[PDB]
Write a protein that binds this ligand. Structure first.
Ligand SMILES: [Zn+2]
Lengths: 141, 117, 76, 60, 49, 94, 177
RNA sequence: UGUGGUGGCGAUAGCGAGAAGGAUACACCUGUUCCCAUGCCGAACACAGAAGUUAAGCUUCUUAGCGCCGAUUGUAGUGAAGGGUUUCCCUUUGUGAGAGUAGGACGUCGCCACGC
RNA sequence: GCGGUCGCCUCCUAAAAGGUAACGGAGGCGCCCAAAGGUUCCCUCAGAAUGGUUGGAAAUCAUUCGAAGAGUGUAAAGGCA
RNA sequence: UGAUGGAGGUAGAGCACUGUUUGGACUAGGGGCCCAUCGGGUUACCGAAUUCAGAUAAACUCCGAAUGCCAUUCAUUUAU
């Protein structure tokens, strides 16, 4: 149970949510980034697999931009228990992402290792991605 | 230290009394206005906001002092100019004060000179 | 079980007479808790922030500059 | 000035070893001796002889 | 601590009013100036004995 | 100098869903002397203005007339493709 | 008394000759002296407050207030409403008589004789000198004083700079070191 | 015409920053014997005055720095009508956002007295 | 069946009038005040900056900045400078 | 149905308070090791204070839709 990122509570349970679509919320700091094209949950461990697939084949530096935390609690029942009684134990820290967001921004290293490690993290996410720079820019920094 | 101003609190207490009671439809306001060397008193109305009658400090009859004497003179002039228009049931103001010192001097001179309260 | 299973009864607030109407002697207008609307002409406030129409007239709502609202009754 | 609450003091003459700095007040009282016009017509007995040059920060 | 108490009108002798006190504060007999319907004047009312 | 100026209605209605599937640009223009209209553009010419000078060019509106020197204010765009919508202008002139 | 008349004679024209006003209604004044005596041991006994109020009433012709807690600190053992300190103010000659007392009697009878510590500035000239001793003043009985406390005194003027407060109190005695 | 006094109108009235002012007004400043006052305190609070000075308050004027109010519109979202997978997305059709605005904006209107 | 629950009150689910169930998601009640009531007057907090013996992270202060960041006998909402 | 004024915090926006949490600049000089039996706190956090950019709400709000609901000596058409 390798959960990286948690919350200080002030609630325990949350409703099982609903997701339709989002917009905007583009490249801020890195020189390269993803775009999700789906709408699902993203649990704890997938971002740690993203960490490792970033950091190993990003050899010797190059900055990372983790941008998305889990916030919401899952639950789950107990096995062998009928339908009926209250919500089970909080087992999961899961935050959803819809199409158009950016999981990670990347700068500091030329494009080869960038597209490498971005492919290397994308296999350990259930989301088809794209690969975006600061492609369309209203200012030349 | 800045000196806090004084007329601000006086007009605050005006606001509290008017927001308690003005109600001046046919029973207008009496008016109690201080300065250093002067007493101003008017009769101001609602809804239109037009005065009815006043009594000047140092433009008219006699003096007096920081006393009842100017104030009784003002009360006489105000009650007589109210009797000119045939008005007997005015509602007071209070300035920003209690009824002690340049107040009941005006008040009872307005009372027993022929104005019902 | 869980510790839930604890609710009250719906005490049925909300306005019970809209604008442009005519009112009997002293009936309810918009039953509040907490002053959300300050009174106006011919309006009474009871012991439970309920609102009155004394003179039989026309209920209308107003501003208070920017801040909050005023019931207003006007006779014929 | 609220009645019946004040302590006791008068313009007490302050004697000195030099020149008689006799021009102030004091709470404690005593025998009324230097009832004088240029000074208090009160007690002198507070007779602090520090001349303000007894520790002459002003003079040396 | 608090007991259901009735005021006694010491004039007409009728168990007229009713109120509540806290007997940790007041070990006395409660005496106020209240009204009576049978007598129509403000009357000293005591605690029932 | 040689550009595309179309015109629109006050409310073109919920035909606006169609468009986006055609290749249209619905947007805002409000300016300095001439206040404010709706005006279409196309996508494959703004990117050719991006290679003319860059991202801070000089815009001259052509109905074979004089110019509205707009100096583009915002562009935040679509998910899932990343292309042109909501092209706000501002004619901060000479 | 005296220092009013020094303002008449020499101080206020020197303040004009330095600061170059457009009226004497532009001039800084001296108004308040605020005095504080807390105990803290009045958790145990307020008889320190008793004789402290006795000492203060023998200093000037007042009796102070009895200032309560306005907090609740278990570290100091405080609830609300626990009386702590006492407040004396000064006006009139009791300004100037106490000023000349500080010139003449008390302050040149304080051990480790150096003068007056300077840095009480507050930016806007608010010199508070937490006094070491209680036995300084000639009104003090050695046979009554039981602690080795001193005095909290707030002095408030209308001096607008620390330079103005320096020049005024230097022209009212106060040997800054 | 200026001041003072008392009125409404969403601060477009406001905050800042700066410049000028005392005929009168107002306000500070003189003192408390007198009414009254302090959980100490003529600082306020009430009084008895009129020495000074425009210093501050206050009045006029500037200023889009702060703050407020903002069209045109794009788009999300959404009623009615439809279709594929039903997680959702798309389309006919009315109706529109919040943002980011361009700009306005350092007031308008009421009554009386006095100086006039 | 064993467990747990059975009356009342504040929120959310509750689909922007009301209303609307679940062994749904939350908290409290079975009192208290002789003034914590009524009237009439007077006052403005939370904080933050600096100087200041006992005095320290803060006891009492003083000066300024400061729109609620406090309080409102008791649960929660809604109010109230 | 059309016209008219009204009840209000669902949809999206959802930052201003209550919240969650990201990276950049500053820090109060704190916690040391101390160089100590005052030049540096070099160096480790610079955290609180701030402070810039970017997000997140069923028990968040600076704001705020259609649509339904309530009314009208209203207008049309029909039978309630
Ligand atoms: Zn009786």
């Amino acid at each position: 149970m390798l959960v990286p990122k948690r919350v200080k509570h002030r609630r325990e349970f949350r409703g099982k949510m609903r997701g339709e679509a989002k917009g905007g919320k583009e490249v801020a700091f890195g020189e390269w980034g993803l775009q999700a094209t789906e709408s699902h949950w993203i649990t704890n461990r997938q971002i740690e697999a993203a960490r490792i697939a970033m950091t190993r084949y990003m050899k010797r530096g190059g900055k990372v931009w983790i941008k998305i935390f889990p916030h919401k609690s899952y639950t789950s029942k107990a096995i062998g228990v009928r339908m009926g009684k209250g919500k089970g134990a909080p087992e999961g820290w899961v935050s959803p992402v819809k199409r158009g967001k950016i999981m990670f921004e990347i700068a500091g290293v030329p494009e080869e290792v960038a597209r490498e490690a971005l492919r290397l993290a994308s296999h350990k996410l259930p989301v088809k991605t794209k690969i975006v720079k600061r492609e369309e820019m209203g200012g030349e920094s | 230290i800045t000196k806090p101003d004084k007329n601000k609190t006086r007009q605050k207490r005006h606001r509290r009394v008017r927001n308690k009671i003005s109600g001046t439809a046919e029973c207008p306001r009496l008016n109690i206005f201080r300065s250093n060397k002067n007493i101003y008193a008017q009769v101001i109305d609602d809804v239109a906001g037009v005065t009815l009658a006043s009594a000047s400090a140092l433009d008219k009859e006699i003096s007096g002092g920081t006393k009842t004497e100017t104030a009784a003179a003002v009360g006489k002039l105000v009650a007589e100019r109210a009797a000119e228009k045939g008005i007997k049931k005015v509602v007071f103001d209070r300035g920003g004060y209690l009824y002690h010192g340049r107040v009941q001097a005006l008040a009872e001179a307005a009372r027993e000179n022929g104005l019902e309260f | 079980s869980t510790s839930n299973g604890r609710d009250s009864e719906s005490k049925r607030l909300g306005a019970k007479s809209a604008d442009g109407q005519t009112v009997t002697g002293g009936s309810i207008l918009y039953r509040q808790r907490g002053t959300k609307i300050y009174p106006g002409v011919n309006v009474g406030i009871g012991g439970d922030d309920t609102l009155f129409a004394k003179v039989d007239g026309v209920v209308r709502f107003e501003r208070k500059g920017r801040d909050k609202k005023q019931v207003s009754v006007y006779p014929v | 000035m609220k009645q019946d609450i004040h302590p006791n003091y008068q313009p007490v003459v302050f004697m000195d070893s030099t020149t008689g700095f006799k021009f102030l007040s004091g709470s404690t009282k005593g025998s009324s001796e230097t009832v004088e016009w240029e000074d208090g017509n009160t007690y002198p007995l507070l007779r602090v002889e520090v001349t303000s040059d007894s520790h002459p920060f002003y003079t040396g | 601590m608090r007991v259901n108490i009735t005021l006694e009108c010491t004039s007409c002798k009728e168990r007229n009013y009713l109120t509540n006190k806290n007997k940790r504060n007041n070990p006395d007999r409660l005496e106020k100036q209240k009204y009576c319907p049978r007598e129509r004047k403000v009357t000293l009312h005591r605690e029932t004995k | 100098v040689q550009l595309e100026v179309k015109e629109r209605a006050i409310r073109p209605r919920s035909l606006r869903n169609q468009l986006r599937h055609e290749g249209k640009v619905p947007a805002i223009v409000y300016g300095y002397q001439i206040e404010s209209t709706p005006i279409y553009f196309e996508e494959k010419d703004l990117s050719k203005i991006l290679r003319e000078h860059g991202a801070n060019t000089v815009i001259k509106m052509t109905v074979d007339g004089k110019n509205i020197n707009t100096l583009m204010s915002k562009a935040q765009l679509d998910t899932f493709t990343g292309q042109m919508l909501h092209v706000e202008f501002l004619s901060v002139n000479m | 008394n005296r220092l009013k008349e020094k303002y008449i004679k020499e101080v206020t024209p020197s303040l004009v000759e330095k600061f170059n006003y457009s009226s004497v209604m532009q001039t800084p004044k001296v108004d308040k002296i605020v005095i504080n005596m807390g105990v803290g041991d009045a958790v145990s006994n307020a008889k320190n407050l008793d004789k402290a109020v006795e000492e203060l009433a023998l200093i000037t012709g007042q009796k102070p207030l009895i200032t309560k807690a306005k907090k609740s600190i278990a570290g100091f053992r405080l609830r609300e409403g626990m009386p702590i300190g006492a407040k004396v103010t000064l006006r009139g000659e009791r300004m100037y008589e106490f000023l000349d007392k500080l010139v003449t009697v008390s302050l040149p009878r304080v051990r480790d004789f150096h003068g007056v510590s300077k840095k009480a500035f507050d930016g806007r000239g608010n010199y508070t000198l937490g006094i070491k001793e209680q036995l300084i003043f000639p009104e003090v009985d050695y046979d009554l004083v039981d602690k080795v406390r001193g005095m909290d005194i707030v002095i408030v003027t209308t001096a607008n700079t620390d330079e103005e407060s320096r020049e005024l109190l230097a022209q009212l005695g106060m040997p800054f070191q």
